[PDB]
Amino acid sequence: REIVHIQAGQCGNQIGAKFWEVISDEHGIDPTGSYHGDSDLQLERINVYYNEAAGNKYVPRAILVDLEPGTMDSVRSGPFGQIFRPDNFVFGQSGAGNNWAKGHYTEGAELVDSVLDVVRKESESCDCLQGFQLTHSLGGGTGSGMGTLLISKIREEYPDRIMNTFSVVPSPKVSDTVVEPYNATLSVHQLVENTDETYCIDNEALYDICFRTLKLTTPTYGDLNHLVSATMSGVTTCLRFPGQLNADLRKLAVNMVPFPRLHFFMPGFAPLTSRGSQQYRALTVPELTQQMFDAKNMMAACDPRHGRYLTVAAVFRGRMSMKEVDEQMLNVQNKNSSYFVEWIPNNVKTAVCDIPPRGLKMSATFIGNSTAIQELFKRISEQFTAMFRRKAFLHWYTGEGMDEMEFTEAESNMNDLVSEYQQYQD
Amino acid sequence: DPAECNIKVMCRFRPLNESEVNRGDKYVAKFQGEDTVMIASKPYAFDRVFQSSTSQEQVYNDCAKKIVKDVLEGYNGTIFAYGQTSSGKNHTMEGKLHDPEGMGIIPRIVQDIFNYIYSMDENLEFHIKVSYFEIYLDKIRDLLDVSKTNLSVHEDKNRVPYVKGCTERFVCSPDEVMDTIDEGKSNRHVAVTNMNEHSSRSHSIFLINVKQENTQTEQKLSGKLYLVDLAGSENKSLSALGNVISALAEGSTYVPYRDSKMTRILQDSLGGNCRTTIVICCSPSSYNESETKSTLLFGQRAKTIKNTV
Amino acid sequence: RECISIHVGQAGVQIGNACWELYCLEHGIQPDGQMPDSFNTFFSETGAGKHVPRAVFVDLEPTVIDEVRTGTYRQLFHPEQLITGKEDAANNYARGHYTIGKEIIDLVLDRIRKLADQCTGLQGFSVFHSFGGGTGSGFTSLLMERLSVDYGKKSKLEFSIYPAPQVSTAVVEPYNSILTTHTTLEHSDCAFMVDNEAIYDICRRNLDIERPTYTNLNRLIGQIVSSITASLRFDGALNVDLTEFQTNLVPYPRGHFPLATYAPVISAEKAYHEQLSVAEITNACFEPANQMVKCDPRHGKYMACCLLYRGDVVPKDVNAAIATIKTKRTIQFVDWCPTGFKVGINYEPPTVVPGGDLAKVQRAVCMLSNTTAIAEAWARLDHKFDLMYAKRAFVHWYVGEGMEEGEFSEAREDMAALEKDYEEVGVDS
Ligand SMILES: Nc1nc2c(ncn2[C@@H]2O[C@H](COP(=O)(O)OP(=O)(O)OP(=O)(O)O)[C@@H](O)[C@H]2O)c(=O)[nH]1
Ligand SMILES: Nc1nc2c(ncn2[C@@H]2O[C@H](COP(=O)(O)OP(=O)(O)O)[C@@H](O)[C@H]2O)c(=O)[nH]1
Known part of the structure; x- marks a missing residue:
């Protein structure tokens, strides 16, 4: 199977650098190097994100869409920046104005064809395509407008392959832009009607979860991004690994979306303990569900405790008992019968990979479809x-x-x- | 608003035929009362059940007649023909367009509208516009203009939905309307290898907009009547329709119109303060007991009599 | 004489790898295929020095069949016999049955027609699927479907792992299991059932371990199953053919589903304790805490049991241990059934994994049976379905996959008469 990432806008782009920063190491791919993989399993399924050309150069199969040069020229002039084939960079030296309309109807609409072009070169790569990953922020031009277009076109070209969307919905408390709700409302619109899996992250839900769940005092963006990218790795890539009970985008989709809207989820990582001290290892498992299912720790802004769930997908990835997993999930479903909706006897979708996050013993990505996101x-x-x-x-x-x-x-x-x-x- | 879900459902079983009898064909349908048909010992009640011999006239009077009055009244309405292929949907909707006996619902409606108009002619100024389009693979194509393909639905300033760029033709007389229908039928054909397959697969939508303004009263009225010959039930629009009907039946405040282009266009004419008649057509014939069950079930989505548990 | 086997769905494949393991293990055939008729009803002597597998493997994701062609046993099957559809699994019946699953079926069949030919007067296909899955529910549905027509003249015993009573996995599970039941019902001969959860209890209560890997439940069924085919198709003092089952086991055409039960489940480390008596194990069989199925005989009157014994057993010991039972009454057997006890005696005792967690006794009782009990299990699983269907829940996932309001509603009505069936054939005199 396969997928083709899409770095729409700056944010979606900035994050690309972090999503690929990670993923690569979770696949032993050095800058331009090849597979140094500590193991041999981090290779039998890579295809999902790369392509074979040289023999040491497995290039990320993503797209970098943006109307502001400086950005991609910061991502391409830094660390892993020199692994993307230049063909991937679909820039728009125009004025990347912060207008949804400027990147969806006037400026972006031009650069689109020169994008779709590539999104096809990558799709028609080889084997069988699964879907496309989409990163961006719903609070700007190149993000909400132009990226929200990229999909409306993608979903016309392959209404078969899936569409996961990673959106950085406008954080509450303080808006890092002014028209924000304009660029946002306009992009969510496009989302509810094209992509079929959206994972909404909030720069301030992160801070919190990053300044109190990681005593981290100076949470730079790189971090937030890093945390996010940690979840999107557990989701996709992960499941493209073996497992007692493995799933894949669809399972995730076909178990999480009761009604066609597309519905948006809220990702949550498992071991989220501060470095030194905290390294409590209380990760037998009840500790991971303890984590994942609490209010704080939900990359979303809203708190689950404020609305039932429709579906849940604990995508664990680390050797554990299909018993202590399948079991825990239950009590959890009964201690909180209150909020977990009833017309679904088993809301939870237990998933279980084998190999865990490179340096960790046991983790578990959480993808919640709660009504709280209302x-x-x-x-x-x-x-x-x-x-x-x-x-x-x-x-x-x-x-x-x-x-x-x-x-x-x-x-x-x-x-x-x-x-x-x-x-x-x- | 009015009743909420003013949806009536009539089940029409197609005539028994000499060919079918010759075959020896086998028996689905038993009748009880005006309303009920029994299949596999299970009764299904509906607003009405028409047996195989029922005339076009009977169907029109029971199904369409009042709706037409409402449209003249200034209200919107929808009439659907639902069923398996060869169930009798087209026969019901159109029948023989020219034959006075044979003609279906649409011809009878057109005739009634004009006749009403001729009678009034006092101070009422009428304007009638028609549109003819089809939905195939959730795409809209203008039957009046083959160039207009893959049209998109839009809502105007005051929420009324419309098909952007869809041809709207003003018709003076019944003949003009019939010609329009004939034109659409012709236009349909082209680039189509198999008409049978194509016709069953594409929903045909005929829209009659009747506007009138009384010069003296100055009150203006506008009504839209959508006549729909659905694709064979044996489809995204059908499912969307099922959801909308069920929602209406439930009395839910929120209806799922967005689920299809069809339901979105229809939104002003379906549910709410509009009359809707669904004519489910079925073959009595032996094989598809199963399909009829489905059709009957679909009709049931709307609110009927609920049985005791 | 033989009985092919089609392990469908990741699970049916994991369980397959397991049941397939136990096999060679008690037949002296290393993972290399070589051992240094009898059992030919499950293994073809490709020549030659090897053995190979007398079955096939069907999954729509490679992941799981892939692992088989990595770990020793890699050498056991033919590179061919392990079918895959690189495409997508999808935890939904529809897609697996209709849409996708379709494409593969032909090819699938081909093997069960290519492997069915090579043999000598076979008896049937032991099918291995996991009721509530995508590739397991759907696909098979049409696999068994296409079999009942291509070989109506044989046995179709499908060994299922039906939905944990409260610990299900997939969110839709019932959709997938009310659909695999209705489509297979009119095609199977005898459907064996092993409840995933009710097996855990056995791992907690009768073996002690809160660390039961799937790889264990598999070792278990991997055991109960060995008692079915393996040893039975193997000479003994009271042989029992596959046909025998369905005959002595199904009172009515509904592909009736008996339950699998094993007697000696005791953990290694206990391995030294004085062994259990012929009477105890026999009695253990009438305990609702040892039956690989959460269908506790809450009322379900047995209507036929096939007590397959293996190891050192004196026919009188049985034709007595059973007599004692026939008169316990609290074990109430159906009315219309005088005697419903098919005593199957084999010679060779069981064969426990070298160092798993299974005791390793010198005699066991793999008793399976049809119990008016499942009246429950089906009920509780049907109800599930409604709740969701009642709101269409994940319906758009199937419709958009070549299904209709028909197949659901019309497969619901189906089982309905399975709740009445399992009710009428019992509870009444
Ligand atoms: N005993 C046992 N049960 C298993 C095993 N693997 C899965 N199951 C059960 O079978 C069901 C899982 O089916 P899946 O693995 O989701 O699906 P599948 O049937 O392989 O087919 P697909 O949905 O298309 O992937 C659940 O009820 C599990 O509890 C196994 O190795 N042993
Ligand atoms: N997590 C996260 N958010 C970002 C990053 N960059 C910008 N954002 C967020 O994105 C919004 C601004 O949109 P921006 O990305 O500049 O739009 P564009 O570049 O014109 O497409 C603000 O809400 C920021 O908090 C980032 O690297 N990580």
């Missing part, structure tokens, strides 16, 4: 209206060839999306 699109949707009402920075959109009915559309859509999700919380 209380986020609400947020976003609110911010919109409060500012849409006055058409705040709307001239930067319309003046870029947009529509007063376009914004209406998205909000509503994504706004209805909130509605539905409640239809199950009850």
Whole structure:
């Protein structure tokens, strides 16, 4: 099987560097080097993310889409930056304006064809394609607009292969941009109707989880990114490993989406202990479920405790008892019968790889489909209206060839999306 | 708003035929009362059950007649023909377009609208527009204009949905409408190897917009009537339709129109304050007991009599 | 004489690798195929010095069949007999049965027609699947389906691992198991059932270990199964053919599902303790805590049991140990059934893994049976289904895979008459 990553925008891009920083080491691939793999198993399934050309050069099969040179020229001028074949860099030296409209209708719409071109060169690579990984932020141009287009096109070209989306939904407390809800509401819209698996991460849900669950005092972006990339590795790549009970994107999809919206999840990693001290090793297993299922530790902003779950997928990856795994999951399902929805006898989807995260003994990625994420699109949707009402920075959109009915559309859509999700919380 | 889910369902069983009798064919359907049909000893009640001999006239009167009045009344409505291929959907919807006896629901509707208009002609100024398009593989193609392919649904300023770029033709008379239908039928054909397969697979949608303004009263009225000949049930739109009907039947505040392009276009005419008649057609014939069961079940999604447990 | 076997679904393959292991282990055939008729009803003498496998392996993800062609045993099967569809598994019936699973079937069949020819007057195909899976539920559904027509004139005993009563895995499981039951029902001869959870209990209560790897449950069924084919197709003082089963085991055409049970489950480390009496093991068979199935005889009246014994057993010991039972009454057998006790005696005692956790006695009782008990197990699994179907839950996943409101609703009605069937054939006189 296979997949083809997609680094839309700067963020989605910045993260690319971290997702690939990791993944590679979790596959023994040095900058341009080959497979130094401490083992021999980190190779029989690599294909999922690379391509064979030389014999020591397995190149990441991702796409780097962005209308701001400097960015990709920071990712390509640093560490692992020199492993991507230049063909991968689909830049847009234009003005990468922070407008969803500027990267979806006017500026991005041009650079698109020169992207799809490659997304096809990579898809028609070899063997059988599974789906595409998509990273980006719903709070900017090259991210929400142009990346949200990249998919609307992808999903017309292969409505068969899957589409996981890793979105950095606009954090609450403080917005790292101003129109944010504009660029956001507009991209979520496109998401709820193309990709079929979305993993929403919040820069501040991370800080928290990174400053209190990792006594880490100076959580640089690199970190946040790093933590995130840690989860997306547990998801995909991982399951493309052996296991007593293994799954793969689809299983994950076909066990997690009760209703076609596409629904968004909230990823959570397992061993998340501070370096030295904490290295408690309390990782027998009840310790991992202890972790994963708590409020804090959910990369999302919202707290599960604020709304039932529809599905859950503990994708563990480290030798354990299909008994102490299958078992724990249960008590968990009974101690919290309250929030776990009922019309699904077994919400949880236990998954079990074998080999764990390179240096760790036992981990377990968590992919939750809780109704709690209602209380986020609400947020976003609110911010919109409060500012849409006055058409705040709307001239930067319309003046870029947009529509007063376009914004209406998205909000509503994504706004209805909130509605539905409640239809199950009850 | 009005009743909420003003959905009526009529089951129409196709005539028995000499060929079928010659074959010796075998027996699904038993009848009880106006409303019920029994298959495999299980009763299914509906608003009405029409046996094999029922006339086009009977179907129109029971199914369509009131809806047409509502449209003239200024309300929207939808009529569907649902069933397996060769169930009798097209016969029911169109029948023989020109034959006074043979004609189906659509011709009868057109006739009734104009006749009503001719009668009024006082201070009411009418305007009738028609659209004819099909949905295949969840894609919309204009039957009036073959160039318009893969059309997209949009909502206007006031939430009304529309098919962007879909041809809208103003029709003066019944003849004009029939010609339009004939044109659409012709246009359908081209680039199609197998019409049978194509016809069963693509939902045909005929839209009649009747607008009128009384010069004196100045009250203006507009009504849309969507006539739909669905794809064979033996499909994304069908499933979408099932979900919408069930939701309406439940009395749910939120209906799943977004699930298909068809349901999205139909949103203003289906459910809410609109009348909807679904004519499920079935063969009495032996094999597809199973398909009829499905059709009956689908009709059941809307609200009927619920049995005791 | 022989009985091919088709291990379908990762699980049916893991269990397969296991049951397949126990085999050579008690037949002196190293993983290299070579040993230094009898058992020919499960192994073809490709010449020659080797043995090979008299079965096949069907999974839509390579992962699991791949591992077989890594670990010793790698040498055992023919590179050919292990079918794969690089494509996608999908924990959904539909896709596995219809859409995807279809593409492979032909090819699959081909082997069970190519392997079915090579032999000499066979008896049937021991099928190994995991009810609630994608490749296991769906696929087989049509595999067994295409068999019942191509060889209606044989035995179709499918050995299933039906849904843990509370500890299921897949979120949809029931969708996949109400569908593998209805499609296979009108095609199997006798369906053996081994409950994944109810086997754990045995690992907790009758062997002590909270560390049971799947690799264990497999060693277990891998045992109970060895008692079915292996040893039985093997000479003895009271041989029992495969046909024998279905005949002495199914009272009615519904591909009736008996339950597998084993007697001596005791952990190594106990290995020295004085062995158990012919009477004790016999009695252990009537305990609802030792039956590889969460169908505790909560009321289910047995209606036929096939007590397969192996090892040192005196026919009188049996034709007495059973007599004592026939008169315990609290073990109430069906009415319309005077005597429903097929005593199968083999010679060679069991053969425990060199160092797993199985005691290793010199006699065992793999008793299987049809019990009005499953009236439950099916019930509890059917109900599940409704709850979700009642909301369509993951329905869009099948529809979009060449299925319809028909197949579900019409397979529900199916089992409905399986809840009435297993009710009527009992509880009444
Ligand atoms: N006893 C036993 N049960 C197993 C084993 N592996 C899986 N199972 C059970 O069988 C079911 C799992 O089926 P899956 O592995 O998800 O699927 P599959 O049937 O192989 O086919 P697919 O869904 O397409 O992957 C669960 O109920 C498991 O508890 C095994 O090795 N032994
Ligand atoms: N986790 C994370 N968030 C980022 C990174 N870079 C920008 N962001 C977030 O992305 C949003 C800004 O969008 P941006 O990526 O600049 O848009 P674009 O570059 O025009 O497509 C803010 O909410 C930031 O917190 C990053 O490297 N990691």
